[PDB]
Ligand binder design. Structure first.
Ligand SMILES: O=C1CC[C@H](N2Cc3c(OCc4ccc(CN5CCOCC5)cc4)cccc3C2=O)C(=O)N1
Ligand SMILES: [Zn+2]
Ligand SMILES: [Zn+2]
Ligand SMILES: [Zn+2]
Lengths: 352, 53, 792
């Protein structure tokens, strides 16, 4: 754990093209000796390398290695490694060294911890009533807003405005729609810390890369929550990233076949990771070939390559059932790097 | 590394090990995209689709 | 920018009141805390006599008197919000009155989370320690031995991390603290013994689990009985070891008891004030036994009457009580043995005007003499009032409801005031809306406690509510503007509202209503439906600028007397604050995101000139000039940012550079260009929560460098109560940051030059340079501060 605003020279994997959220898992599979030996030396040190944010990178996140496996198959030493994002940063200098790896002089960004809005206006006679009995309803929230924000009569703004900037209220509003995408998770699963909660939803939403960078560069966690909730309410249609305007699927089609949410990271037979979003119905997709069960990420289902009808780029795979006693008998698995969250027309702009 | 299969892009340690696997790609469309599983007729066709990822 | 801030009116709200023998052992004193000020009165049989008023370089957070063994009179412990601890002694030598500092230190720990229930400061009854609850899971102990002049302290880990209230218990063998805490199981009461030698916690005498769900207050009972009284919302219980009593009087259920005070030094009588102004008496009915013991038989609560919404209560003598109020005026009240004709034992004696909380204001030239008068919306709920401040002469116009916004329409010789009243729903009391001379209700069809919003038409001479217009059901009035629009020669009242429904978080519908007061009623001259909350409106050269959620929109007044959208500008931040100067438009949200927009008159659209996003809670903002912009942010700070003078890259021109930082010590709610008077340029008044009115004027670079020098020099000859340094007090402060001040000059410290001794006046002008570059005679600087005392 580095100090805030401090500087570190952290190595970079030259074949890691990805926006890494703090707390998000990064799966790696290295063949080359310079990449392999670099992983081993981090294990006997800090396990911390840099995942840069794009080939000109301006920000990024440090990754800590928490898993390591070795396979010596077919005369080639396979090294698979799982990492987890940790600290955000801004790049100061990138310097390529002897082998393919490179060093990065880096300044650590601090996680902006802001107090409550009423931390400055609350009267001390009512300080004793700031702790409320925990939540056992939608009338409990009408009391939480009244009680927590009573001192708004001392400012120029009502209570219902401070709720839109209240961290605890925004997480619950995001929790509501997140549960519509997954019949499990429950009130737990997601962290209670707003900073940790914002970084989980940042890695959970099916958003493109330039939208993931904006969530990284958003300073406060309260702003990161409002922008995240803004994406879920406005960007209801997912279009093909290539041709921009071909609508593949909408927000109401998302569901969770795997218990790990409606969007888990899966690995293909050659090391490529695919943040696959499972939806019920899809549009403007051409099926390539016949179904196949080989290396299927969902046992009992057969995958078929699905491509965009207009631009002929890869969008995902259609999964059909190989058994009758399975529901759904059909669903679509759309990879993230192929979609583009779109605000359907009636100028709507994402708000912080 | 070298000794890479031209159809699926798997790397082997020895050119010997390459050949014993080379006849698992029996078919008209033996070239497979290591990213999505797309099969193609020629190596050049696989390259164009690969570099669109 | 180089700016100059001077206090035009000291804070008026009362956040603390303690009594004791501070001046002399015989004298009974009343010490009152007004944010950054401390008033000391001697309580006479007639009333109250002022003795000495001092100011501090901090926001007084805890103010308590105590007398350790072997001390002549009582000593004063004061802790600031910035964690400056100090023990103070009163000392008078004829007429020279000075508050000496017997000990001082900074108790701030680098770690620790600031507690939810606030800073708590308690003292052992026998004065052997000072207990502080600043951070969760910690308890700072300051040994009260006269070798601790730097106030060295130690911490003790607290396995209970959510403490509600804590107090020191009376009549205990060892120093015992008794507190109420909450955990997943519920709310409980637990006691700890403190060992100033083991520096840890020992097992307390007793504990009671499963106390009231919303138990909020701990009252320590003196040694005649000992123990503690725990007061929540539903119950008043007494505990001591294995002695238990509890009552649930239905008379204290309509509100919550939030303050207390002991009436007799034996703990037999207690005063309780609630959130709505009620005053109760908690009597501990004792039963005299035959073996010399006195047991506690029952608890009894009787309603005494109504006062101002009391933040702090303290009993003086001869049935006189001081009601310290933050929302409304503080008062001296007299209690009677028998109730009056309405069943109230409380009768008012004196009332001290409290300007806080100022939620809106406006400068008006009432008497046309070019003097300038400030008329503010002040108070909350039944304490709401208008205050007409002059050159200071304050007139009070009570409204008995909460006033929100104000604007002056000279043509009607009238004030337009937005207000809200708390209530088939019936009013709780006759208010300004219910007592208007004429009353209208709005019709549109375009779209427990409840808020009813009204536009009140208040006469500029008599200040009587000529008309009260009740807005729609579930309609929340947000903005108010008086202006002429386009070619219309009539001046109108414009109101921007929002449709708030407890089910929808963000507002999706709102209204912009055009009103006119011609005869004795308000006519609705057309309306316009918008798909959001109208947060702010400003007149923009015969046109109406408005905010709709994140949208800034310029409206035009047609010949059909209707509003037509001209151009929009969609922002990625919530357009909450809206201020204009010429064709420049300043936009800001609650999170200190500052956006400068320019209306291009030749293109009929908006252009984004500059931007600056620094996530922090902003409360108010204002345009100083076409380049510099002033605002208020957490915590009680001011800031200025400007368009970059280095006009090299298009990138750099779109970044606003921060040039001013300053810990004002107040929570600014409204900025207002104007002055109270007939060298420096600009005059911006601001009202605050504590009732303080301040000035913001800009200095030349020549003067700024001079007054900054005189600042560091006047800070070497001025004694500060508690030995707090101006540099520390005025430095930009939030829990994450500590940075010195820049671009701001404390006029209060500069004005203290005219009140220091001439031998010390020369001490600061020695080796000074004045660019009139000769040295600065002591007489050149009274001329500069005499002119700086004329802005206010
Ligand atoms: O749900 C899904 C959707 C589709 C996705 N798949 C399947 C797939 C392939 O699928 C044919 C195949 C699968 C497995 C093999 C086994 N080998 C391993 C390497 O050495 C030779 C032997 C060979 C060919 C081939 C290439 C890429 C992919 C790819 O991304 C996936 O993994 N799971
Ligand atoms: Zn496409
Ligand atoms: Zn192969
Ligand atoms: Zn492919």
């Amino acid at each position: 754990l580095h100090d805030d605003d401090s500087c570190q020279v952290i190595p970079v994997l030259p074949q890691v093209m990805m926006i890494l959220i703090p707390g998000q898992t990064l799966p790696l599979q290295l063949f080359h000796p310079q990449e392999v030996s670099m992983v081993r030396n981090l294990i006997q040190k800090d396990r911390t390398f840099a995942v840069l944010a794009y080939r000109e990178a301006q920000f990024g996140t440090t990754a800590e290695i928490y898993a390591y496996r070795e396979e010596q198959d077919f005369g080639i030493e396979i090294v698979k490694v799982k990492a987890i994002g940790r600290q955000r940063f801004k790049v100061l200098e990138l310097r390529t060294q002897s082998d393919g790896i490179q060093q990065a002089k880096v300044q650590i960004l601090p996680e902006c911890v802001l107090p409550s809005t009423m931390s400055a206006v609350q009267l001390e006679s009512l300080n004793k009533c700031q702790i409320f009995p925990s939540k056992p309803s939608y009338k409990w929230w009408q009391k939480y807003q009244k009680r927590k924000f009573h001192c708004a009569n001392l400012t120029s703004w009502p209570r219902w405005l401070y709720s839109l900037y209240d961290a605890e209220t925004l997480m619950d509003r995001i929790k509501k729609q997140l549960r519509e995408w997954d019949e499990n998770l429950k009130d737990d699963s997601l962290p209670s810390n707003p900073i940790d909660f914002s970084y989980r939803v940042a890695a959970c939403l099916p958003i493109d890369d330039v939208l993931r960078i904006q969530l990284l560069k958003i300073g406060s966690a309260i702003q990161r929550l409002r922008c995240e909730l803004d994406i879920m309410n406005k960007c209801t249609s997912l279009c093909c990233k290539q041709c921009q305007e071909t609508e593949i699927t909408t927000k109401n089609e998302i569901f969770s076949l795997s218990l790990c949410g409606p969007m888990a990271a899966y690995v293909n037979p050659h090391g490529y990771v695919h943040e696959t979003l499972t939806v019920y119905k899809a549009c403007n997709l051409n099926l390539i070939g016949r179904p196949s069960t080989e290396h299927s990420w969902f046992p009992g289902y057969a995958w078929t390559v699905a491509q965009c009808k207009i631009c002929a780029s890869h969008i995902g795979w259609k999964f059909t059932a190989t058994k009758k006693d399975m529901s759904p008998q059909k669903f679509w698995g759309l990879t993230r790097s192929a979609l583009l969250p779109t605000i359907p027309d009636t100028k709507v702009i994402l708000c912080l | 590394y070298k000794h890479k299969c031209k159809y699926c892009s798997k790397v082997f340690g020895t050119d010997s090990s390459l050949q014993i696997h080379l006849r698992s790609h029996t078919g008209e469309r033996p070239f497979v995209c290591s990213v999505c599983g797309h099969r193609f007729t020629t190596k050049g066709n696989l390259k164009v689709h690969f570099h669109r990822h | 920018s180089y700016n100059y801030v001077v206090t035009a009116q000291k804070p008026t709200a009362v956040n603390g009141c303690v009594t004791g023998h501070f001046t002399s052992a015989e004298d009974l004193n009343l010490l009152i805390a007004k944010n950054t000020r401390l008033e000391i009165y001697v309580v006479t049989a007639e009333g109250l006599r002022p003795v000495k008023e001092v100011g501090m370089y901090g926001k007084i957070a805890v103010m308590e008197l105590f007398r350790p063994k072997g001390e002549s009179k009582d000593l004063l412990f004061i802790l600031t919000a910035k964690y400056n601890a100090c023990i103070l002694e009163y000392k008078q030598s004829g007429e020279s009155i000075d508050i000496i500092t017997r000990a001082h230190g900074n108790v701030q720990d680098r770690i620790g989370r600031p507690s939810e229930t606030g800073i708590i400061g308690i003292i052992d009854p026998e004065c052997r320690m000072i207990g502080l609850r600043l951070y969760d899971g910690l308890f700072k102990v300051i040994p009260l031995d006269r070798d601790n002049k730097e106030l060295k302290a130690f911490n003790i880990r607290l396995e209970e991390l959510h403490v509600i209230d804590v107090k020191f218990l009376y009549g205990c063998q060892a120093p015992t603290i008794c507190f109420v805490y909450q955990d997943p199981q519920g709310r409980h009461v637990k006691t700890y013994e403190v060992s100033l030698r083991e520096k840890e916690f020992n097992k307390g005498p007793w504990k009671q689990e499963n106390v009231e769900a919303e138990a909020s207050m701990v009252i320590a009972v003196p040694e005649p009985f000992g123990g503690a009284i725990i007061i929540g919302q539903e119950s008043i219980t007494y505990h001591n070891g294995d002695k238990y009593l509890a009552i649930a009087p239905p008379i204290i259920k309509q509100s919550t008891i939030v303050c207390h005070n002991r009436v007799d030094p034996n703990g037999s009588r207690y005063l309780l004030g609630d959130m709505e102004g009620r005053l109760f008496m908690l009597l501990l009915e004792k039963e005299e036994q035959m073996d010399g013991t006195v047991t506690l038989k029952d608890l009894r609560v009787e309603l005494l009457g109504e006062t101002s919404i009391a933040e702090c209560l303290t009993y003086l003598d001869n049935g006189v009580v001081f009601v310290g109020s933050r929302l409304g005026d503080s008062q001296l009240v007299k209690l009677n043995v028998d109730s009056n004709e309405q069943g109230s034992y409380v009768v008012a004696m004196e009332t001290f005007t409290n300007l806080g909380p100022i939620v809106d204001m406006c400068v008006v030239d009432l008497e046309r003499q070019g003097q300038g008068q400030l008329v503010t919306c002040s108070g909350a709920f039944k304490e709401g009032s208008l205050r007409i401040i002059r050159n200071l002469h304050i007139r009070t116009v009570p409204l008995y409801e909460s006033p929100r916004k104000i604007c002056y329409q000279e043509v009607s010789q009238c004030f337009g005031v937005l207000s809200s009243r708390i209530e088939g729903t019936t009013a709780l009391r006759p208010s300004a809306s219910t007592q208007a001379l004429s009353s209208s209700v709005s019709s549109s069809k375009l779209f427990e406690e409840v808020e009813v919003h009204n536009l009140l038409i208040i006469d500029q001479h008599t200040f009587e509510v000529l008309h009260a217009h009740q807005f729609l059901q579930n309609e929340y009035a947000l903005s108010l503007v008086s202006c002429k629009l386009g070619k219309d020669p009539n001046t109108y009242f414009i109101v921007g509202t929002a449709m708030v429904y407890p089910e929808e978080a963000e507002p999706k519908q709102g209204r912009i209503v055009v009103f006119q007061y011609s005869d004795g009623k308000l006519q609705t001259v057309a309306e316009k439906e918008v798909k959001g909350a109208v947060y702010s409106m400003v007149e923009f050269n015969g046109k109406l600028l408005a905010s709709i959620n994140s949208t800034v929109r310029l409206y035009e007044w047609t010949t059909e007397k209707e509003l037509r959208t001209e151009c929009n500008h969609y922002n990625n931040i919530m357009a909450l604050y809206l201020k204009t100067k010429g064709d420049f438009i300043l936009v800001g949200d609650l999170m200190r995101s500052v956006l400068l927009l320019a209306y291009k008159p030749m293109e009929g659209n908006f252009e984004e000139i500059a931007r600056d996003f620094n996530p922090n809670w902003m409360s108010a903002v204002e345009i100083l000039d076409d380049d510099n912009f002033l605002g208020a942010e957490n915590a009680f700070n001011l800031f200025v940012c400007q368009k970059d003078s280095a006009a090299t890259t298009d990138e750099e021109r779109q970044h606003l550079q921060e040039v001013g930082l300053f810990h004002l010590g107040e929570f600014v709610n409204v900025f207002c260009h104007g002055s109270l008077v007939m060298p420096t340029q600009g005059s911006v008044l601001f009202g605050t929560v504590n009732g303080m009115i301040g000035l913001v004027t800009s200095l030349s670079e020549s003067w700024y460098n001079l007054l900054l020098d005189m600042q560091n020099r006047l800070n070497k000859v001025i004694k500060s109560v508690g030995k707090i340094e101006h540099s520390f007090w005025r430095s930009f402060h939030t829990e994450r940051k500590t940075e010195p001040a820049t671009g701001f000059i404390d006029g209060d410290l500069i004005e203290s030059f005219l009140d220091i001794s001439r031998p010390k006046m020369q001490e600061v002008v020695a080796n000074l340079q004045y660019d009139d570059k000769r040295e600065a005679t002591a007489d050149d600087l009274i001329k500069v501060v005499e002119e700086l005392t004329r802005i206010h």
